[PDB]
Amino acid sequence: SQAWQPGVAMPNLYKMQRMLLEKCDLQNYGDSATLPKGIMMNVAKYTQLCQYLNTLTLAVPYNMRVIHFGAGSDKGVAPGTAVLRQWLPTGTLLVDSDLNDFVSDADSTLIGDCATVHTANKWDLIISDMYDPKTKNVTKENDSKEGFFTYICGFIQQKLALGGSVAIKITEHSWNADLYKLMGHFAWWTAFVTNVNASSSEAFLIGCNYLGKPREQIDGYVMHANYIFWRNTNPIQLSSYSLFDMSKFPLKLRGTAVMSLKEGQINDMILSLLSKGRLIIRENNRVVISSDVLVNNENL
Amino acid sequence: AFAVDAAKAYKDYLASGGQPITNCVKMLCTHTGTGQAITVTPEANMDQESFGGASCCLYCRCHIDHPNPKGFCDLKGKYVQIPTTCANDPVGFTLKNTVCTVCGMWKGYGCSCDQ
Ligand SMILES: C[S@@+](CC[C@H](N)C(=O)[O-])C[C@H]1O[C@@H](n2cnc3c(N)ncnc32)[C@H](O)[C@@H]1O
Ligand SMILES: Cn1c(=O)c2ncn([C@@H]3CN(C(=O)CCN)C[C@H]3O)c2n(C)c1=O
Ligand SMILES: [Cl-]
Ligand code: NA
Ligand code: NA
Ligand SMILES: [Zn+2]
Ligand SMILES: [Zn+2]
């Protein structure tokens, strides 16, 4: 029955194992889903991701702030940003970013390495599709990766509002142990595989409702091995079925409450509310962003 | 007095038989929407496709300034409904056609204010 879902989430029992990392071997490797006429893979992928996020307890405040890293494509456009903007309530502030230039429907776009990106304010939802194809090297050992994953872990800890949520793209080889460890700082987490891309080891690591502190201690090396074990032993049938039913697609504007609050003020009743998707904790000032520019004169 | 004319250049390129701009971002939607031309969310009806606006704007896609004196874009950040019969060239379509300021449909592809 999973073929009518948008995708498949890691079952809890696989999260509780203590497996060793193996090579990922997917039964349907190389197969592809049949997409609706004229629909791009990345539109379908992000649609299913949002369809799955609709089933979680996302905080959706008035004046929501969403940032999207890795948003450009080799086409020079931003398919994923367009799906996010369709999903999110009208008026949602949406910022996107990528290493290379691209045209986008986001409210503001920053071009450059993600490490050059700085923002004054906190965010309610962080999406990343950052990915480097050169990390995929089947002839070398598969160790935790740094690069943009180091930036993402810092960005989450420093700039994600309590109660906010993340979805970060990983693969067999594109992954980071501290990011998994940080999943334990959310009230709930999973690894979600879109049905259109089920033939790939790609998944979105989703953290639902950020708590600012560990709820549970996760060894990220072990958990990635658990993830690959699950994938290795649970074939997922490619399916695009969920793309044909968009009647319930929009994220419900829950009008979730926003409060400023200080570390001493986060009691268990507050943490209760954060965990249920009922509260966002951050300033509600103006949203200001920037990207660092390195200055050089090459003349001589 | 010199000013590049991209709109005219694309029209002439198309006339000469050039391939229309591709990788316009087509959205999944119900196709039971209002049918208006340019909207904050996909509104295609049964006879339209909905596209992300920026990807269908000649000026956005060519990295050139917009005609508006303030540089503002009509399409960026919105969704543009394109008749399915014309969706092989969304950029051509939005350039050549104009939106009724009263009903919001495309003049000639939904606007009945003139009847
Ligand atoms: C899987 S593709 C993204 C496709 C895009 N999300 C879409 O909607 O079609 C991965 C992207 O991540 C970007 N990327 C990789 N490393 C990065 C880094 N260190 N900083 C910023 N962007 C990076 C690449 O430029 C590339 O466009
Ligand atoms: C990221 N990724 C995968 O996920 C994947 N899954 C299966 N396979 C292939 C099938 N294989 C066999 O049949 C081995 C017989 N000795 C092993 C692989 O060549 C994959 N490959 C190549 C890959 O790069
Ligand atoms: Cl663990
Ligand atoms: Na959220
Ligand atoms: Na990989
Ligand atoms: Zn434009
Ligand atoms: Zn009219």
Side-chain angles (χ1 to χ4, degrees), chain A residues 201-284:
Chain A
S201 71
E202 168 186 275
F204 290 89
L205 270 190
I206 294 161
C208 191
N209 307 128
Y210 183 53
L211 302 178
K213 58 181 221 194
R215 196 192 49 91
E216 102 177 73
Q217 216 60 62
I218 285 171
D219 177 320
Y221 298 83
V222 175
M223 193 63 82
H224 190 58
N226 290 345
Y227 164 75
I228 295 300
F229 179 62
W230 168 54
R231 301 302 315 277
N232 274 347
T233 57
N234 289 73
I236 300 165
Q237 176 187 338
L238 283 154
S239 165
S240 49
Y241 294 173
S242 74
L243 309 174
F244 288 88
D245 188 8
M246 302 286 291
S247 58
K248 310 270 172 253
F249 183 65
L251 180 60
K252 305 53 50 183
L253 167 52
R254 297 177 172 110
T256 312
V258 178
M259 287 179 3
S260 206
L261 282 192
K262 290 72 200 74
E263 263 272 41
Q265 309 203 75
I266 315 283
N267 67 49
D268 289 341
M269 174 270 263
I270 295 289
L271 285 163
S272 185
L273 291 165
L274 296 171
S275 286
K276 295 182 172 83
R278 304 233 172 100
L279 174 64
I280 281 280
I281 293 164
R282 58 161 169 83
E283 49 71 47
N284 215 356

Coordinates of all heavy atoms in Angstrom, one line a residue, chain A residues 201-284:
Chain A
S201 N 19.5 6.2 -3.0 CA 19.7 6.2 -1.6 C 19.5 7.5 -1.0 O 19.6 7.7 0.3 CB 21.2 5.8 -1.3 OG 22.1 6.8 -1.7
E202 N 19.1 8.5 -1.8 CA 18.7 9.8 -1.2 C 17.6 9.6 -0.2 O 16.7 8.7 -0.3 CB 18.2 10.7 -2.3 CG 17.4 12.0 -1.9 CD 16.8 12.7 -3.0 OE1 17.6 13.5 -3.7 OE2 15.7 12.5 -3.4
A203 N 17.6 10.5 0.8 CA 16.5 10.7 1.8 C 16.6 12.1 2.3 O 17.6 12.8 2.1 CB 16.6 9.7 2.9
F204 N 15.5 12.6 2.9 CA 15.4 13.8 3.6 C 15.4 13.5 5.1 O 14.5 12.9 5.6 CB 14.2 14.7 3.2 CG 14.3 15.2 1.8 CD1 13.9 14.5 0.7 CD2 14.9 16.4 1.6 CE1 14.0 15.0 -0.5 CE2 15.1 16.9 0.3 CZ 14.6 16.2 -0.8
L205 N 16.5 13.9 5.8 CA 16.5 13.9 7.2 C 15.6 15.0 7.8 O 15.9 16.2 7.6 CB 17.9 14.1 7.8 CG 18.7 12.8 8.0 CD1 20.0 13.3 8.8 CD2 17.9 11.8 8.8
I206 N 14.5 14.7 8.5 CA 13.5 15.6 8.9 C 13.6 15.7 10.4 O 13.4 14.6 11.1 CB 12.1 15.3 8.4 CG1 12.1 15.4 6.9 CG2 11.1 16.1 9.1 CD1 10.9 14.7 6.3
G207 N 13.7 16.9 11.0 CA 13.6 17.1 12.4 C 12.3 17.9 12.6 O 12.2 19.0 12.1
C208 N 11.4 17.4 13.5 CA 10.1 18.0 13.7 C 10.1 18.6 15.0 O 10.2 17.9 16.0 CB 9.0 17.0 13.5 SG 7.4 17.6 13.4
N209 N 9.9 20.0 15.1 CA 9.8 20.8 16.3 C 11.0 20.8 17.2 O 11.3 20.0 18.0 CB 8.6 20.3 17.1 CG 7.3 20.1 16.3 OD1 6.6 19.1 16.3 ND2 6.9 21.2 15.7
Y210 N 11.9 21.9 16.9 CA 13.2 22.0 17.6 C 13.1 22.4 19.0 O 12.3 23.3 19.4 CB 14.0 23.0 16.8 CG 15.4 23.2 17.2 CD1 16.3 22.1 17.4 CD2 15.9 24.5 17.5 CE1 17.6 22.4 17.8 CE2 17.2 24.7 17.9 CZ 18.0 23.6 18.0 OH 19.3 23.9 18.5
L211 N 13.8 21.7 19.9 CA 13.8 21.9 21.3 C 15.0 22.6 21.9 O 15.0 22.9 23.1 CB 13.6 20.5 22.0 CG 12.3 19.7 21.6 CD1 12.4 18.4 22.4 CD2 11.1 20.5 21.9
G212 N 16.1 22.7 21.1 CA 17.2 23.5 21.6 C 18.2 22.7 22.4 O 19.2 23.2 22.8
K213 N 17.9 21.4 22.7 CA 18.7 20.6 23.6 C 18.4 19.2 23.3 O 17.3 18.9 22.8 CB 18.4 21.0 25.1 CG 16.9 20.8 25.5 CD 16.6 21.2 26.9 CE 15.6 20.2 27.5 NZ 15.0 20.7 28.8
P214 N 19.3 18.2 23.7 CA 19.0 16.8 23.3 C 17.8 16.3 24.1 O 17.8 16.3 25.4 CB 20.3 16.1 23.7 CG 20.9 17.0 24.7 CD 20.6 18.4 24.3
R215 N 16.9 15.8 23.4 CA 15.8 14.9 24.0 C 16.3 13.5 24.1 O 15.8 12.7 25.0 CB 14.6 15.0 23.1 CG 13.4 14.5 23.8 CD 12.3 14.3 22.8 NE 12.8 13.6 21.6 CZ 12.7 12.2 21.5 NH1 12.1 11.5 22.5 NH2 13.3 11.6 20.5
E216 N 17.3 13.1 23.3 CA 17.8 11.7 23.2 C 19.1 11.8 22.5 O 19.4 12.7 21.7 CB 16.8 10.8 22.4 CG 17.2 10.6 20.9 CD 16.3 9.6 20.2 OE1 15.2 10.0 19.9 OE2 16.7 8.5 20.0
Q217 N 20.0 10.9 22.9 CA 21.4 10.8 22.5 C 21.5 9.9 21.3 O 21.2 8.7 21.5 CB 22.3 10.4 23.7 CG 23.6 11.1 23.7 CD 23.5 12.6 23.8 OE1 22.9 13.1 24.8 NE2 24.0 13.4 22.9
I218 N 21.9 10.4 20.2 CA 22.0 9.6 18.9 C 23.4 9.6 18.5 O 24.1 10.7 18.4 CB 21.1 10.2 17.9 CG1 19.6 9.9 18.2 CG2 21.5 9.7 16.5 CD1 18.7 10.6 17.3
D219 N 24.0 8.4 18.3 CA 25.3 8.2 17.6 C 25.0 8.2 16.1 O 24.4 7.3 15.6 CB 25.9 6.9 18.1 CG 27.2 6.6 17.4 OD1 27.3 6.9 16.2 OD2 28.1 6.1 18.1
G220 N 25.5 9.3 15.5 CA 25.2 9.5 14.1 C 25.9 8.5 13.1 O 25.3 8.2 12.0
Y221 N 27.0 8.0 13.5 CA 27.7 6.9 12.7 C 26.8 5.7 12.6 O 26.5 5.1 11.6 CB 29.1 6.6 13.2 CG 30.0 7.8 13.1 CD1 30.0 8.7 14.1 CD2 30.9 7.9 12.0 CE1 30.9 9.8 14.0 CE2 31.7 9.0 11.9 CZ 31.7 10.0 12.9 OH 32.5 11.1 12.9
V222 N 26.3 5.3 13.8 CA 25.4 4.1 13.9 C 24.1 4.4 13.2 O 23.5 3.5 12.5 CB 25.1 3.8 15.4 CG1 24.1 2.7 15.5 CG2 26.4 3.4 16.1
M223 N 23.5 5.6 13.4 CA 22.2 5.8 12.8 C 22.2 5.8 11.3 O 21.3 5.4 10.6 CB 21.6 7.1 13.3 CG 20.1 7.3 13.1 SD 19.1 6.0 13.9 CE 19.0 6.7 15.5
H224 N 23.3 6.3 10.7 CA 23.4 6.3 9.2 C 23.5 4.8 8.8 O 22.9 4.5 7.7 CB 24.6 7.1 8.7 CG 24.6 7.2 7.2 ND1 23.5 7.9 6.6 CD2 25.5 6.9 6.3 CE1 23.8 7.9 5.3 NE2 24.9 7.3 5.1
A225 N 24.2 4.0 9.5 CA 24.3 2.6 9.2 C 22.9 1.9 9.3 O 22.5 1.1 8.5 CB 25.3 1.9 10.1
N226 N 22.1 2.4 10.4 CA 20.8 1.9 10.5 C 19.9 2.3 9.3 O 19.1 1.6 8.8 CB 20.1 2.5 11.7 CG 20.6 1.9 13.0 OD1 21.3 0.9 13.0 ND2 20.3 2.5 14.1
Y227 N 20.1 3.5 8.8 CA 19.4 4.0 7.6 C 19.7 3.2 6.4 O 18.8 2.8 5.7 CB 19.7 5.5 7.4 CG 19.3 6.0 6.0 CD1 17.9 6.2 5.7 CD2 20.2 6.1 5.0 CE1 17.5 6.6 4.5 CE2 19.8 6.5 3.7 CZ 18.4 6.7 3.5 OH 18.0 7.1 2.2
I228 N 21.0 2.9 6.1 CA 21.3 2.1 5.0 C 20.8 0.7 5.1 O 20.4 0.1 4.2 CB 22.9 2.2 4.8 CG1 23.3 3.6 4.5 CG2 23.3 1.2 3.8 CD1 22.7 4.2 3.2
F229 N 20.9 0.1 6.4 CA 20.3 -1.2 6.6 C 18.8 -1.2 6.2 O 18.4 -2.1 5.4 CB 20.4 -1.6 8.1 CG 19.8 -2.9 8.4 CD1 20.3 -4.1 7.8 CD2 18.8 -3.0 9.3 CE1 19.7 -5.3 8.1 CE2 18.2 -4.2 9.6 CZ 18.7 -5.4 9.0
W230 N 18.0 -0.3 6.7 CA 16.6 -0.2 6.3 C 16.5 -0.1 4.8 O 15.8 -1.0 4.2 CB 16.0 1.1 6.9 CG 14.7 1.4 6.3 CD1 13.6 0.6 6.3 CD2 14.2 2.7 5.8 NE1 12.5 1.2 5.7 CE2 12.9 2.5 5.4 CE3 14.9 3.9 5.6 CZ2 12.1 3.5 4.8 CZ3 14.1 4.9 5.0 CH2 12.8 4.7 4.6
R231 N 17.2 0.8 4.1 CA 17.1 0.9 2.6 C 17.5 -0.4 2.0 O 16.9 -0.9 1.0 CB 18.0 2.0 2.1 CG 17.6 3.4 2.6 CD 16.2 3.8 2.3 NE 15.8 3.5 0.9 CZ 16.0 4.3 -0.1 NH1 16.7 5.4 0.0 NH2 15.6 3.9 -1.3
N232 N 18.6 -1.0 2.5 CA 19.1 -2.2 1.9 C 18.1 -3.4 2.0 O 18.2 -4.3 1.1 CB 20.4 -2.7 2.5 CG 21.6 -2.0 1.9 OD1 21.4 -1.4 0.8 ND2 22.7 -2.1 2.5
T233 N 17.2 -3.4 3.0 CA 16.4 -4.5 3.2 C 14.9 -4.3 2.9 O 14.1 -5.2 3.1 CB 16.5 -5.1 4.6 OG1 16.2 -4.0 5.6 CG2 17.9 -5.6 4.9
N234 N 14.5 -3.0 2.5 CA 13.2 -2.7 2.3 C 13.1 -2.0 0.9 O 13.1 -0.7 0.9 CB 12.6 -1.8 3.4 CG 12.4 -2.5 4.6 OD1 13.4 -2.9 5.3 ND2 11.2 -2.8 5.0
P235 N 12.9 -2.7 -0.1 CA 12.7 -2.1 -1.4 C 11.5 -1.2 -1.4 O 10.5 -1.5 -0.7 CB 12.5 -3.3 -2.4 CG 13.2 -4.5 -1.6 CD 12.8 -4.2 -0.2
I236 N 11.6 -0.1 -2.1 CA 10.5 0.8 -2.2 C 10.1 0.9 -3.7 O 11.0 1.1 -4.5 CB 10.8 2.2 -1.6 CG1 11.1 2.1 -0.1 CG2 9.6 3.1 -1.8 CD1 11.8 3.3 0.5
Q237 N 8.8 0.6 -4.0 CA 8.3 0.6 -5.3 C 8.3 2.1 -5.8 O 7.6 2.9 -5.2 CB 6.9 0.0 -5.4 CG 6.2 0.1 -6.8 CD 4.8 -0.4 -6.7 OE1 4.4 -1.2 -5.8 NE2 4.0 0.0 -7.7
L238 N 8.9 2.4 -6.9 CA 8.8 3.7 -7.5 C 7.3 4.0 -7.7 O 6.6 3.1 -8.3 CB 9.5 3.7 -8.8 CG 11.0 3.8 -8.7 CD1 11.7 3.2 -9.9 CD2 11.4 5.3 -8.6
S239 N 6.9 5.2 -7.4 CA 5.5 5.5 -7.6 C 5.4 7.0 -7.7 O 6.0 7.8 -6.9 CB 4.6 5.0 -6.5 OG 3.3 5.6 -6.5
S240 N 4.5 7.5 -8.6 CA 4.2 8.9 -8.7 C 2.7 9.1 -8.4 O 2.2 10.2 -8.7 CB 4.5 9.4 -10.1 OG 4.0 8.5 -11.1
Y241 N 2.0 8.1 -7.8 CA 0.6 8.2 -7.6 C 0.1 9.5 -6.9 O -0.9 10.1 -7.3 CB 0.0 7.0 -6.9 CG 0.2 5.6 -7.6 CD1 -0.1 4.4 -7.0 CD2 0.6 5.6 -9.0 CE1 0.0 3.2 -7.7 CE2 0.7 4.4 -9.7 CZ 0.4 3.2 -9.0 OH 0.5 2.0 -9.7
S242 N 0.8 9.9 -5.8 CA 0.4 11.0 -5.0 C 0.4 12.3 -5.7 O -0.2 13.3 -5.2 CB 1.2 11.0 -3.7 OG 2.5 11.6 -3.9
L243 N 1.1 12.4 -6.8 CA 1.2 13.7 -7.5 C -0.1 14.0 -8.2 O -0.3 15.2 -8.5 CB 2.3 13.6 -8.6 CG 3.7 13.1 -8.1 CD1 4.5 13.0 -9.4 CD2 4.3 14.0 -7.2
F244 N -1.0 13.1 -8.4 CA -2.2 13.4 -9.1 C -3.3 13.9 -8.1 O -4.4 14.2 -8.6 CB -2.7 12.1 -9.8 CG -1.9 11.8 -11.0 CD1 -0.8 11.0 -10.9 CD2 -2.3 12.3 -12.3 CE1 0.0 10.7 -12.1 CE2 -1.5 12.0 -13.4 CZ -0.4 11.2 -13.3
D245 N -3.1 14.0 -6.8 CA -4.1 14.5 -5.9 C -3.5 15.6 -5.1 O -2.8 15.4 -4.1 CB -4.6 13.4 -5.0 CG -5.8 13.9 -4.2 OD1 -6.4 15.0 -4.4 OD2 -6.2 13.1 -3.3
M246 N -3.8 16.8 -5.5 CA -3.2 18.0 -4.9 C -4.3 18.8 -4.2 O -4.1 19.9 -3.7 CB -2.6 18.9 -6.0 CG -1.5 18.2 -6.7 SD 0.0 18.0 -5.7 CE 0.4 19.8 -5.6
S247 N -5.5 18.2 -4.0 CA -6.6 19.0 -3.3 C -6.3 19.4 -1.9 O -6.7 20.5 -1.5 CB -7.9 18.1 -3.3 OG -7.7 16.9 -2.6
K248 N -5.4 18.6 -1.2 CA -5.1 18.9 0.2 C -3.7 19.4 0.3 O -3.1 19.3 1.4 CB -5.4 17.7 1.0 CG -6.8 17.1 0.8 CD -7.9 17.7 1.7 CE -9.3 17.2 1.3 NZ -10.1 18.3 0.6
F249 N -3.1 19.9 -0.7 CA -1.6 20.1 -0.7 C -1.2 21.3 0.2 O -0.3 21.2 0.9 CB -1.1 20.4 -2.1 CG 0.3 20.6 -2.2 CD1 1.2 19.6 -1.9 CD2 0.8 21.8 -2.6 CE1 2.6 19.8 -2.0 CE2 2.2 22.0 -2.7 CZ 3.1 21.0 -2.4
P250 N -1.9 22.4 0.1 CA -1.4 23.6 0.9 C -1.2 23.4 2.4 O -2.1 22.8 3.0 CB -2.5 24.7 0.6 CG -3.2 24.2 -0.6 CD -3.2 22.7 -0.5
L251 N -0.1 23.9 2.9 CA 0.1 23.8 4.3 C -0.9 24.7 5.0 O -1.2 25.8 4.6 CB 1.5 24.4 4.6 CG 2.0 24.4 6.0 CD1 2.1 23.0 6.6 CD2 3.4 25.0 6.1
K252 N -1.6 24.1 6.0 CA -2.6 24.7 6.7 C -2.0 25.9 7.6 O -1.1 25.7 8.3 CB -3.4 23.8 7.7 CG -4.0 22.5 7.1 CD -3.1 21.6 6.3 CE -1.8 21.3 7.0 NZ -0.8 20.5 6.2
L253 N -2.6 27.1 7.4 CA -2.0 28.2 8.2 C -2.6 28.1 9.6 O -3.7 28.6 9.9 CB -2.4 29.6 7.5 CG -2.1 30.9 8.2 CD1 -0.7 31.0 8.9 CD2 -2.4 32.2 7.4
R254 N -1.9 27.4 10.5 CA -2.3 27.2 11.8 C -2.3 28.4 12.7 O -2.8 28.3 13.8 CB -1.4 26.1 12.4 CG -1.5 24.7 11.7 CD -0.6 23.6 12.3 NE -0.9 22.3 11.7 CZ -0.1 21.7 10.8 NH1 1.0 22.2 10.4 NH2 -0.5 20.5 10.4
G255 N -1.8 29.5 12.2 CA -1.6 30.7 13.0 C -0.9 30.5 14.3 O -1.1 31.2 15.3
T256 N 0.0 29.5 14.3 CA 0.8 29.2 15.5 C 1.3 30.4 16.2 O 1.7 31.4 15.5 CB 2.0 28.3 15.1 OG1 1.5 27.2 14.3 CG2 2.6 27.8 16.4
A257 N 1.4 30.4 17.5 CA 1.8 31.5 18.3 C 3.4 31.7 18.3 O 4.1 30.7 18.4 CB 1.3 31.4 19.7
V258 N 3.8 32.9 18.3 CA 5.2 33.3 18.4 C 5.4 34.1 19.7 O 4.7 35.1 19.9 CB 5.7 34.1 17.2 CG1 7.2 34.5 17.4 CG2 5.5 33.3 15.9
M259 N 6.4 33.7 20.4 CA 6.8 34.4 21.7 C 8.3 34.6 21.7 O 9.0 33.7 21.4 CB 6.4 33.6 22.9 CG 4.9 33.5 23.1 SD 4.5 32.5 24.6 CE 6.2 32.0 25.1
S260 N 8.7 35.8 22.2 CA 10.1 35.9 22.6 C 10.2 35.3 24.0 O 9.2 35.3 24.8 CB 10.5 37.4 22.6 OG 11.9 37.5 22.4
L261 N 11.3 34.7 24.3 CA 11.5 34.0 25.6 C 13.0 33.8 25.8 O 13.8 33.6 24.8 CB 10.7 32.7 25.7 CG 9.2 32.7 26.0 CD1 8.8 31.3 26.3 CD2 8.8 33.6 27.1
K262 N 13.4 33.7 27.0 CA 14.8 33.6 27.5 C 15.0 32.2 28.0 O 14.1 31.5 28.5 CB 15.1 34.7 28.5 CG 15.2 36.1 27.9 CD 13.7 36.7 27.6 CE 13.7 37.8 26.5 NZ 14.0 37.4 25.1
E263 N 16.3 31.8 28.1 CA 16.6 30.4 28.4 C 16.0 30.0 29.7 O 15.6 28.8 29.9 CB 18.1 30.2 28.4 CG 18.7 29.6 27.0 CD 18.7 28.1 27.0 OE1 17.7 27.5 27.5 OE2 19.7 27.5 26.5
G264 N 16.0 30.9 30.7 CA 15.4 30.5 32.0 C 13.9 30.3 31.9 O 13.3 29.7 32.9
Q265 N 13.3 30.8 30.9 CA 11.8 30.8 30.8 C 11.3 29.5 30.1 O 10.1 29.4 30.0 CB 11.3 32.0 30.0 CG 11.8 33.3 30.5 CD 10.9 34.4 30.1 OE1 9.8 34.6 30.6 NE2 11.3 35.2 29.1
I266 N 12.1 28.6 29.6 CA 11.7 27.5 28.9 C 11.4 26.4 29.9 O 12.3 25.6 30.3 CB 12.7 27.0 27.8 CG1 13.2 28.2 27.0 CG2 12.0 26.0 26.9 CD1 12.3 28.7 25.9
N267 N 10.2 26.3 30.4 CA 9.8 25.3 31.3 C 9.2 24.0 30.6 O 9.3 24.0 29.3 CB 8.7 25.9 32.3 CG 7.4 26.3 31.6 OD1 6.9 25.5 30.8 ND2 7.0 27.5 31.8
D268 N 8.7 23.1 31.3 CA 8.3 21.8 30.7 C 6.9 22.0 30.0 O 6.6 21.3 29.1 CB 8.1 20.8 31.8 CG 9.5 20.3 32.3 OD1 10.5 20.5 31.6 OD2 9.6 19.7 33.4
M269 N 6.1 23.0 30.5 CA 4.9 23.3 29.8 C 5.1 24.0 28.4 O 4.5 23.7 27.4 CB 4.0 24.2 30.7 CG 2.7 24.7 30.0 SD 2.9 26.3 29.2 CE 2.4 27.5 30.4
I270 N 6.1 24.9 28.4 CA 6.6 25.4 27.1 C 7.1 24.3 26.2 O 6.7 24.2 25.0 CB 7.7 26.5 27.4 CG1 7.1 27.7 28.1 CG2 8.3 26.9 26.1 CD1 6.2 28.5 27.3
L271 N 8.0 23.5 26.7 CA 8.6 22.4 25.9 C 7.5 21.4 25.4 O 7.6 20.9 24.3 CB 9.6 21.6 26.8 CG 10.9 22.3 26.9 CD1 11.8 21.7 28.0 CD2 11.7 22.2 25.6
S272 N 6.4 21.2 26.2 CA 5.2 20.5 25.8 C 4.6 21.1 24.5 O 4.3 20.4 23.6 CB 4.2 20.5 26.9 OG 3.1 19.7 26.7
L273 N 4.4 22.4 24.6 CA 3.8 23.1 23.5 C 4.7 23.1 22.2 O 4.2 22.9 21.1 CB 3.6 24.6 23.9 CG 2.5 24.7 25.0 CD1 2.6 26.1 25.6 CD2 1.2 24.5 24.3
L274 N 6.0 23.3 22.4 CA 6.9 23.2 21.3 C 6.8 21.8 20.6 O 6.7 21.7 19.4 CB 8.4 23.4 21.8 CG 8.6 24.8 22.3 CD1 9.9 24.8 22.9 CD2 8.5 25.9 21.2
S275 N 6.7 20.8 21.4 CA 6.7 19.4 20.9 C 5.5 19.1 20.2 O 5.5 18.2 19.3 CB 6.9 18.5 22.1 OG 8.2 18.5 22.6
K276 N 4.4 19.8 20.4 CA 3.1 19.6 19.8 C 2.9 20.5 18.5 O 1.8 20.4 17.9 CB 2.0 19.8 20.8 CG 2.0 18.8 21.9 CD 0.8 19.0 22.8 CE 0.6 18.0 23.9 NZ 1.5 18.2 25.0
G277 N 3.9 21.2 18.2 CA 3.7 22.1 17.0 C 2.8 23.3 17.3 O 2.2 23.9 16.4
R278 N 2.7 23.7 18.6 CA 1.8 24.7 19.0 C 2.5 26.1 19.3 O 1.8 27.1 19.6 CB 1.0 24.3 20.2 CG 0.3 22.9 20.0 CD -1.2 23.0 20.3 NE -1.9 21.8 19.9 CZ -2.2 20.8 20.6 NH1 -1.9 20.8 21.9 NH2 -2.8 19.7 20.1
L279 N 3.8 26.1 19.3 CA 4.5 27.3 19.7 C 5.8 27.5 19.0 O 6.6 26.5 18.7 CB 4.8 27.2 21.2 CG 5.7 28.3 21.8 CD1 4.9 29.6 21.7 CD2 6.0 28.1 23.2
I280 N 6.1 28.7 18.6 CA 7.4 29.1 18.0 C 8.0 30.2 18.9 O 7.4 31.1 19.3 CB 7.2 29.7 16.6 CG1 7.0 28.6 15.6 CG2 8.4 30.6 16.2 CD1 8.3 27.9 15.1
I281 N 9.3 30.0 19.2 CA 10.0 30.9 20.1 C 11.2 31.6 19.3 O 12.2 30.9 18.9 CB 10.6 30.3 21.3 CG1 9.4 29.9 22.2 CG2 11.5 31.2 22.1 CD1 9.8 28.9 23.3
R282 N 11.1 32.9 19.0 CA 12.0 33.7 18.3 C 11.5 35.1 18.4 O 10.4 35.4 18.7 CB 12.2 33.3 16.9 CG 11.0 33.3 16.0 CD 11.2 33.3 14.5 NE 10.0 33.1 13.7 CZ 9.2 34.1 13.4 NH1 9.3 35.3 13.9 NH2 8.2 33.8 12.6
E283 N 12.4 36.1 18.1 CA 12.0 37.4 17.8 C 11.1 37.5 16.6 O 11.1 36.6 15.8 CB 13.3 38.3 17.7 CG 14.4 37.7 16.7 CD 14.1 37.7 15.2 OE1 13.6 38.7 14.7 OE2 14.3 36.6 14.6
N284 N 10.4 38.6 16.5 CA 9.5 38.8 15.3 C 9.9 40.1 14.7 O 9.1 40.8 14.1 CB 8.0 38.8 15.7 CG 7.2 38.2 14.6 OD1 7.7 37.9 13.5 ND2 5.9 38.0 14.9

